[PDB]
Amino acid sequence: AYAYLFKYIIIGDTGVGKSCLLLQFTDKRFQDLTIGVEFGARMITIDGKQIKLQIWDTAGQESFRSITRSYYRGAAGALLVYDITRRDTFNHLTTWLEDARQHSNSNMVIMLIGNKSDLESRREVKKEEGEAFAREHGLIFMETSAKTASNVEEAFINTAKEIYEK
Ligand SMILES: Nc1nc2c(ncn2[C@@H]2O[C@H](COP(=O)(O)OP(=O)(O)O)[C@@H](O)[C@H]2O)c(=O)[nH]1
Ligand SMILES: [Mg+2]
């Protein structure tokens, strides 16, 4: 009835900041890596209700270009991350998105994340390109910095609000 558990997965290319977004959200710190068993949790509040976010970092899946069924199983939300300094990470979004289409529950919320927003001297992908990609595919989008915490809390909380309100 009254308390909630939302399973999240974090997906996207190598080095986009999946691990750092996890650690920033759960521990408020920015930095070992146990592939296949790399996770964290944090309690939040939406509409006065207690919601436990159980969050899975899918590092190690990148080489496969696909997410194992056990990550998708019961996943309520997914953060699909690219690295704004590396256009190739932006280019591979459609293949991550198709993997999710084929193998995830259609109700799984997906938020598009352009990470490393602090790195303005190396930006390759404009914020507007992330926005347009998200619109075309019916997703919410935010730029984050796992380094500075910018929009990190907002990304996880807004995903949860979308899951809860759907
Ligand atoms: N400046 C900056 N560096 C970041 C950010 N997120 C991650 N990094 C750096 O990028 C590297 C890769 O991030 P990581 O979380 O390990 O990527 P992953 O393979 O997707 O898990 C890290 O070692 C950090 O040095 C960010 O928001 N800003
Ligand atoms: Mg990782």
What CATH number is attached to the domain comprising 46?
A: 3.40.50.300
Q: Which atom of ligand 1 is nearest to the CA of 150?
A: 27
Cβ neighbours of 113 (radius 10 Å): 32
Q: Which one, of 75, 90, 162, lies nearest residue 133 by Cα? A: 90
Q: State how far Cα 125 lies from the chain centre.
A: 18
Q: Residues with Cβ < 8 Å from 38, sequence gap 6 or more?
A: 19, 22, 56, 57, 59
Q: Where are the alpha helices (DSSP H) in 46-92?
A: 69-72, 87-91
What determination technique applies here?
Answer: X-ray
Q: With contact defined as beta carbons under 8 Å apart, do 130 and 143 qualify?
A: yes
Resolution (A): 2.1
Ligand 1 pocket: which residues have CB below 6 Å?
14-20, 59, 115-116, 118-119, 145-147
| 116 Cα to the center of ligand 2, angstroms | 14
Domain assignment of residue 41, given as a range: 3-166
Which two tokens mark 154?
A: 């907002």
Q: With contact defined as beta carbons under 8 Å apart, do 109 and 9 qualify?
A: no
Number of domains in the chain: 1
DSSP state string for 150-163: TTHHHHHHHHHHHH
Which two tokens mark 126?
A: 């404009």
| 18 Cα to the center of ligand 2, angstroms | 5
Nearest-ligand number for the alpha carbon of 12: 1
SS (H, E, C) 98-140: HHHHHHCCCCCEEEEEEECCCCHHHCCCCHHHHHHHHHHHCCE
